[PDB]
Amino acid sequence: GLTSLQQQKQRLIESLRNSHSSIAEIQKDVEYRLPFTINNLTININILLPPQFPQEKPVISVYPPIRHHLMDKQGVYVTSPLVNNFTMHSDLGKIIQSLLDEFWKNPPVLAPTSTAFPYLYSNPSGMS
Q: What is the DSSP string of 27-55?
A: ETTTEEEEEEEETTEEEEEEEE--TTTTS
CA 57 distance to own-chain centroid: 11
Residue 60: its H or E element: strand 59-63
Q: Which residues contact 62 (CB under 8 A, 6 or more apart)?
A: 43, 44, 45, 46, 71, 76, 78
Provide the edge-to-edge strand list for the sheet that holds 24-27. Answer: 24-27, 31-38, 41-48, 59-63
Residue 26: its H or E element: strand 24-27
Distance CA 3, CA 1 (A): 5
* Fold of the CATH domain 18-105: Ubiquitin Conjugating Enzyme (3.10.110)
Residue type, 65: P
Domain boundaries, the chain: 18-105
Distance CA 89, CA 29 (A): 19
Q: After which residues is the chain broken (C to N over 2.5 A)?
A: none
